Design an enzyme around this catalytic site. Structure first.
Site, PDB file in Angstrom:
ATOM      1  N   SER A 115       0.862  -1.178   0.000  1.00  0.00           N
ATOM      2  CA  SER A 115       0.000   0.000   0.000  1.00  0.00           C
ATOM      3  C   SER A 115       0.922   1.260   0.000  1.00  0.00           C
ATOM      4  O   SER A 115       1.726   1.415  -0.932  1.00  0.00           O
ATOM      5  CB  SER A 115      -0.902  -0.110   1.232  1.00  0.00           C
ATOM      6  OG  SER A 115      -2.056   0.715   1.204  1.00  0.00           O
ATOM      7  N   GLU A 150      -9.315  -5.103  -3.512  1.00  0.00           N
ATOM      8  CA  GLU A 150      -8.618  -4.032  -2.846  1.00  0.00           C
ATOM      9  C   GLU A 150      -9.563  -2.975  -2.205  1.00  0.00           C
ATOM     10  O   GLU A 150      -9.218  -2.358  -1.185  1.00  0.00           O
ATOM     11  CB  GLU A 150      -7.684  -3.332  -3.849  1.00  0.00           C
ATOM     12  CG  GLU A 150      -6.562  -4.156  -4.416  1.00  0.00           C
ATOM     13  CD  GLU A 150      -5.348  -4.160  -3.523  1.00  0.00           C
ATOM     14  OE1 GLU A 150      -5.445  -3.654  -2.389  1.00  0.00           O
ATOM     15  OE2 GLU A 150      -4.292  -4.674  -3.933  1.00  0.00           O
ATOM     16  N   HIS A 196      -7.543  -6.113   0.928  1.00  0.00           N
ATOM     17  CA  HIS A 196      -6.383  -5.284   0.905  1.00  0.00           C
ATOM     18  C   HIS A 196      -5.574  -5.679   2.128  1.00  0.00           C
ATOM     19  O   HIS A 196      -6.094  -5.728   3.231  1.00  0.00           O
ATOM     20  CB  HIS A 196      -6.822  -3.862   1.070  1.00  0.00           C
ATOM     21  CG  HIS A 196      -5.709  -2.866   1.014  1.00  0.00           C
ATOM     22  ND1 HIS A 196      -4.929  -2.672  -0.114  1.00  0.00           N
ATOM     23  CD2 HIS A 196      -5.286  -1.955   1.926  1.00  0.00           C
ATOM     24  CE1 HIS A 196      -4.081  -1.681   0.114  1.00  0.00           C
ATOM     25  NE2 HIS A 196      -4.279  -1.229   1.346  1.00  0.00           N
TER      26      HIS A 196
END
Ligand SMILES: *[C@@H]1O[C@H](CO)[C@@H](O)[C@H](O)[C@H]1NC(C)=O
Ligand SMILES: *[C@H]1O[C@H](CO)[C@@H](O)[C@H](O)[C@H]1NC(C)=O
Length: 532
Positions: free
Chosen positions: A197, A324, A437
């Site tokens: 990320s 995600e 995610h």
């Protein structure tokens, strides 16, 4: 002693740690910068002054001051990401897991945590470097860097709070690894930085920044790339948010000196308390204090840099997860809740689109909505939910990363792309969130090798293949075994654009990872909002 290492900044003392019936060394909380406290808050980081005596590196350091997720008190799914240590502005430390016996010159892997640039710790359980160090005999390093205002407040021009200092914190840790990893048996000429990320955008940012590229060899980016819509802002926006931050703390706003002096008088928690009040729109997947395109760390705009090849050319391995966007919708989009299937109505879907493409006019919103609506079943609530999930993940993670991989591959020396889509058998989050995610991290760090965490056997095999791909790639610039009989992860090329799925099934190769949707996000929509 194996737990005693002498570095350029002083002598450090580790601790032995058991890992999978065996043991390795761990040097926890080694300092690489002067505590950025007091007047040093918002300032660039300074090198840790060398010390006499032996540094006790047997326990984890403090985590940087950050916002803490209290959305589901006592829920492991969200608490596992929260700081598991005392928070403190004195947090610039790094951690090292070293195989035993100490190698002479082995592959180094440096981990950069995610957390949207407003949160994150290097001391989290899912980030425990021991399984990877041990299983792949790599020297594992996890750094830390200031987040939120502390790490990213930006008043361009001032040197008191120039911005990007959290990025600089990371660079200083990479500098220190460059300089000292050898004494721990690490090969400084072979360090791979990797993150997820914001940690992934960070990785791409050091590839981009001229001041950072000579400090590492290779790079791994998980669910993040530097050009992400939420990962950077202009100096004007940075400035605009810093002042707003100040206006929330009743600060004198006549001058940067005035502003900064005030922000420095406030206790950490006061800054963290009003942090979110400065976002310019009602939005999902946007964070207040992030890297700024300042002309220094980033010489020019990220796009022109990518276009010109103005970046470190090496090998890279990166990819994304299937779903995600589910996290961000669960946290702020109307209709999603942790304990329901979160079947969305047309109106909530629309509320969602607005919340996901904040920087969008009506024409733009209609286009996103048209692109994601099945007009033959527009009231199907599961379709609306999943559609909105895709919109968030495609706009915020997949398409920017696909745009980055495509620009990079043109001048790079090797690209390997994955699409991680196995959902963990023990995930405590609801089914509707899919392959969430951040849930490829536990496979990368090898938690499925520890029985008591309850993964399936096929999951442990995946984790081992992933760990071996990561470490082999870090070692060589290719994730594949020189002559293995296992199936080969093909190289991603401008032409073929091949990638592989990453799951418990037999590896499958594919091409053009989400082209249809990413042509919409990377070419069409941007072109449409610019004409409107
Ligand atoms: C990487 O660079 C080497 C030498 O600079 C070259 O011979 C090789 O073909 C390159 N590989 C790729 C994938 O570009
Ligand atoms: C330092 O590490 C921890 C710090 O709390 C402590 O328990 C341990 O006894 C200390 N060891 C030495 C050698 O100072």
């Amino acid at each position: 002693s194996e737990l005693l290492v002498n570095t350029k900044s002083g002598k450090v003392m580790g601790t032995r740690v058991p890992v999978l019936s065996s043991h390795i060394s761990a040097f926890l909380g080694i300092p690489f910068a002067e505590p950025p406290v007091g007047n040093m808050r918002f300032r660039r980081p300074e090198p840790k002054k060398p010390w006499s005596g032996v540094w006790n590196a047997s326990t984890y350091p403090n985590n940087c001051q950050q916002y803490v997720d209290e959305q589901f008190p006592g829920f492991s799914g969200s608490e596992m990401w929260n700081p598991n240590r005392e928070m403190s502005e004195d947090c610039l430390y790094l951690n090292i897991w070293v195989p035993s016996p100490r190698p002479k010159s082995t592959t180094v892997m440096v981990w950069i945590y995610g957390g949207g640039f407003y949160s994150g710790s290097s001391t989290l359980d899912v980030y425990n470097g021991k399984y990877l160090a041990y299983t792949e005999e790599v020297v594992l390093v996890s750094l830390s860097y200031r987040v939120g205002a502390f790490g990213f407040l930006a008043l361009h021009g001032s040197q008191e709070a120039p911005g990007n200092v959290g990025l600089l914190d990371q660079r200083m840790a990479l500098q220190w690894v460059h300089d000292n990893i050898q004494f721990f048996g690490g090969d400084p000429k072979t360090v791979t930085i990797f993150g997820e990320s914001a940690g992934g955008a960070s990785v791409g940012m050091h590839i981009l920044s001229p001041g950072s590229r000579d400090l590492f060899r290779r790079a791994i980016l998980q669910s993040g790339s530097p050009n992400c819509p939420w990962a950077s802002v202009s100096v004007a926006e940075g400035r605009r948010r810093a002042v707003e931050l100040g206006r929330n703390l009743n600060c004198n706003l006549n001058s940067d000196e005035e502003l900064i002096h005030c922000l420095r008088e406030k206790k950490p928690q006061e800054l963290i308390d009003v942090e979110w009040n400065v976002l310019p729109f009602d939005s999902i997947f946007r964070f207040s204090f992030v890297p700024v395109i300042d002309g220094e760390f980033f010489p020019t705009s990220l796009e022109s840099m990518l276009n010109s090849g103005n970046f470190k050319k090496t090998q890279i391995l990166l990819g994304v997860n299937k779903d995600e966007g589910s996290f961000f919708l669960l946290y702020g989009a109307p209709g999603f809740s942790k304990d329901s299937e979160s079947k969305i109505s047309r109106e909530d879907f629309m509320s969602g689109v607005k919340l996901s493409v904040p920087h969008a006019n009506d024409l733009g919103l209609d286009a996103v909505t048209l692109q994601y609506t099945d007009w033959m079943d527009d009231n199907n609530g599961i379709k609306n939910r999943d559609g909105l999930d895709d919109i968030v993940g495609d706009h915020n993670v997949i398409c920017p990363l696909m745009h980055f991989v495509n620009k990079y591959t043109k001048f790079g020396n090797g690209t390997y792309l994955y699409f991680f889509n196995h959902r963990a058998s023990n995930l405590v989050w609801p089914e509707w969130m899919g392959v969430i995610h951040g849930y490829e991290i536990e496979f990368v760090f090898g938690l499925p090798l520890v029985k008591e965490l309850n993964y399936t056997a096929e999951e442990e095999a995946l984790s081992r293949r992933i760990m071996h791909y990561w470490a082999t790639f870090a070692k060589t610039g290719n994730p594949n075994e020189p002559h293995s009989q296992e199936s080969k992860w093909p190289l991603f090329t401008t032409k073929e654009q091949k990638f592989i799925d990453l799951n418990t099934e037999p590896m499958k190769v594919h091409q053009r990872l989400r082209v249809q949707m990413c042509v919409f996000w990377n070419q069409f929509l941007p072109k449409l909002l610019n004409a409107t």
